Structures are given as C-alpha cells and as structure tokens.
Amino acid sequence: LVKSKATNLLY
C-alpha cells in the first residue's frame, strides 16, 4: 500500500 506523506512546517 501507499504510505501518506508526513506533516511538517518549520517542524
């Protein structure tokens, strides 16, 4: 399956 992209915004 396809893993979702991690969330990060200036950490």
Helix (H, G, I), strand (E, B) or coil at 4: coil
Rounded Cα distance between 4 and 10, Å, is: 19
Size of the site for other proteins (CB under 8 A): 4
Running DSSP on this structure, what letter comes out for residue 10?
A: -
CB 8 → other proteins: shortest distance, Å? 18
- Out of 3, 6, 9, 10, the only residue in the binding site for other proteins (CB under 8 A) is 3
> What do you get for the CA distance between the two ends of the chain, in Å?
26
**1 binds other proteins, rule: CB under 8 A:** yes
Q: Is 4 in the site for other proteins (CB under 8 A)?
A: yes
Contact positions toward other proteins, by CB under 8 A? 1-4
